[PDB]
Structure 1
Amino acid sequence: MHHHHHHLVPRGSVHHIKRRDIVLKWELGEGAFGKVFLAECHNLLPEQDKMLVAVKALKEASESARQDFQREAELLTMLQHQHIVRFFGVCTEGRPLLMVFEYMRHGDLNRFLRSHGPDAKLLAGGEDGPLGLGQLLAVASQVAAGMVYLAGLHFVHRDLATRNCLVGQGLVVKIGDFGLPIRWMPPESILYRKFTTESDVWSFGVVLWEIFTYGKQPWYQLSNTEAIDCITQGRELERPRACPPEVYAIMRGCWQREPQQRHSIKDVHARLQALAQAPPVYLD
């Protein structure tokens, strides 16, 4: 499993939550493996007597999982930043074993982008304004910030996509993981299964494309095989209509064929916070 996070050592202890303090309300979507519930958490934070959390319940017993659960929990207690989905602690009192996370009310970034995009009405007869340049750049900057954090910990995500980012209380974007993302992968990751900080910056560039297409499928016009072919052949995703050349220049910097030629996430977030600060002059 996380043999790729073996080098990481958490200094702090895992917080244990009592069963009683967790009051499950109803499921958050269609959780795979676990299923995720929205729950009321008692005595977790002093300021908020009964706060809202996302609770992931583990499916299987056996030291195989019980051991994995403990390592996943330990690593998560270590990952604490404004742009990383917060982990609160675990519950071991009886079965199933629970993992408690911060509630992100607007769900994943992909649906969010789709629902705040030009094709929104086409994606909903369902319920029934497109996110502006600054709004898109804020999202883009928030994600890069999470990636600058993880690179600081020598942590490789391996699955950075808008589907794995979450939106919360007032357009706050945080990187998480819902658990082969070939379309977001660089050629060294496809062919040689080599995942580094450089592999993650490429995926960030794909995330940037996803943001500026309002959740469109990377290589949508291609099958999985067709996509692998174009990635290894050196083909780059076309600059979205919504994307200014200034933002496209960053994606291209992430997609540099040679990993050691790819633009650092520090430089990427820096450039993104600067454009996010003053949106560039762009007209379609």
Structure 2
Amino acid sequence: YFQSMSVKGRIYSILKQIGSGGSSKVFQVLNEKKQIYAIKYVNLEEADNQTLDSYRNEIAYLNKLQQHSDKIIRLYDYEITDQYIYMVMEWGNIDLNSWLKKKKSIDPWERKSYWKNMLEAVHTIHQHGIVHSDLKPANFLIVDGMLKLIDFGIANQMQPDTTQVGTVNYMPPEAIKDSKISPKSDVWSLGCILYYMTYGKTPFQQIINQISKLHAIIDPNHEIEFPDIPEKDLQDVLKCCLKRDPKQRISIPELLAHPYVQIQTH
């Protein structure tokens, strides 16, 4: 029940575990001033040089980029050694994958406000050359009704083995047809998340067969349902995000000047 750890001399008191993946554990902890944080611990015992440089790189970027937007998660401090990495981060109520897994109805205002957070955070990483290229709702954390981007998909996702889960619902068609990596790949994946918040599922979610789903994502003859809704700006945004051709698909800077994001509906 009572557990503890240090990170750069400062003592944190572990309350519980709030995450896991590969050889990393996220804990909900309290510092000496009874302030709540999330420490991500990562193990390097069997991680190769590539893997380690991927973690070092991600860290450096996350640290740098938090200044540039407040829609990226705070990395308050970290402790990096040959054996492990602690990262003392901003603690959030719940991730968006779990939040949307609760709710059927999402408040139009809340959806738009989330959409904006997502655009801003993702735009920031793009501005420093980073395409995420694996954006899911899992990647976004709700901190006081504000969505923070948890990670940049820079680090190499090593598997547990002794014991969200590689889902292709958010996968852009260019990725499925196999070096080059367009920032508009992320626009598709964001579009898929918004499509979820708009219509209740991802566009190819109803496709039960895996190989079929992949095929459907690419097949231009295979249309996507955009059932008409009061928010016609929302319907517009989704159609523009989910163009299969990356060159015809809308840009982040464009999505930011879009009526959905700018026009005040009251």
Pick the TM interval, shorter chain.
0.7 to 0.9
Aligned to 1:176: 150
In 2, Cα distance between equivalents of 1:239 and 1:248:
7
The separation in 2 between residues aligned to 1:240 and 1:50, in whole angstroms, is 49
**1:166 lines up with 2:178 in the alignment:** no
Question: Is the contact between residue 73 and residue 89 of structure 1 (CA under 8 Å) also seen in structure 2?
Answer: no
- Relative to structure 1, is the Cα distance of residues 241 and 101 closer, same or farther in structure 2, using a 3 angstrom cutoff? farther
Shift of 1:230: 0.8
Structure 1 residue 163 displacement after superposition: 1.8
Say if 1:230 and 1:93 are closer, same or farther in 2 by CA, change over 3 A: closer
The residue number in structure 1 matching 2:30 is 40
Aligned equivalent of 1:247: 234
What are the equivalent positions in structure 2 for 1:253-268 lying under 5 Å apart? 253-268=240-255
Measure how far apart 1:143 and its partner are: 0.9
Q: Is the 8 Å Cα contact of residues 173 and 218 (structure 2) preserved in structure 1? A: yes
Contact 1:36–1:54 under 8 Å retained in 2: yes
Q: Secondary structure of the equivalent of 2:215?
A: helix
Unaligned runs of 5+ in 1: 1-15, 43-48, 118-129, 280-284
CA gap of 1:19–1:267, structure 2 versus 1, over 3 A, is same
Aligned-pair distance for 1:242?
6.2
Residue 202 to residue 92, structure 1, CA distance change in 2 (3 Å) = closer
Q: Using the alignment, how far apart are the partners of 1:230 and 1:237 within structure 2?
A: 10
| 1:131 corresponds to | 106
Task: Tell whether the 8 Å contact from 1:88 to 1:102 is kept in structure 2 after alignment.
Answer: yes
Q: Please show how residues 152-163 of structure 1 align to structure 2 within 5 Å.
A: 152-163=127-138
2:45 counterpart of 1:61: yes
In 2: Cα distance, 1:94 partner to 1:205 partner: 39
C-alpha deviations, 1:33-57, integer Å up to 9, x for none?
A: 3121011235xxxxxx442211111
CA contact (8 A) 1:212 1:240 kept: no
Question: 1:75-133, CA deviations, whole angstroms, 9 ceiling, x for partnerless residues?
Answer: 2212212211222231247964312221111x11122123232xxxxxxxxxxxx3321
Q: Which residue type is aligned with residue 64 of structure 2? A: M
1:78 and 2:64 are equivalent in the alignment: yes
Between the two proteins, what is the percent identity of the paired residues?
25
The equivalent residue for 1:8 is none
User: What is aligned with 2:256?
Assistant: 269
Cα deviation 1:140-162 (Å, max 9, x = unaligned): 12111112222221210011111
In 1, the alpha carbon distance for the partners of 2:149 and 2:223 equals: 24
Cα RMSD of the aligned pairs, angstroms, is 2.7
**Aligned twin of 2:171:** 185
Are 1:197 and 2:183 matched, yes or no? yes
Instruction: Verify: 1:21 aligned to 2:11, yes or no.
Output: yes
Q: What is the TM-score normalised by the length of structure 2? A: 0.79
Task: Tell me which amino acid in the other structure corresponds to 2:24.
Answer: G
Question: How far has the Cα of 1:201 moved from its partner?
Answer: 0.9
Preserved CA contact (<8 Å) 2:226 2:239: no
Cα deviation, 1:175-216, whole Å, max 9, x if unaligned, reads 2249554321222111126421111111111111022134x3
Corresponding pairs, count: 242
**Counterparts of 1:186 and 1:31 in 2: how far apart (Å)?**
24
Structure 2 CA distance for partners of 1:51 and 1:192, relative to 1, 3 Å: same
Shifted more, 153-162 versus 143-152: the winner is 143-152
Say whether the 8 Å CA contact 2:131–2:186 is kept in structure 1: yes
Contact in 1 for aligned 2:204/2:217 (Cα 8 Å): no
User: Which segments of 5 or more consecutive residues in structure 2 lack a partner in the other structure?
Assistant: 1-5, 158-165
Counterpart AA for 1:157: H
3-state DSSP class of the match of 1:258?
A: coil
CA distance in 1, matches of 2:168, 2:54: 25
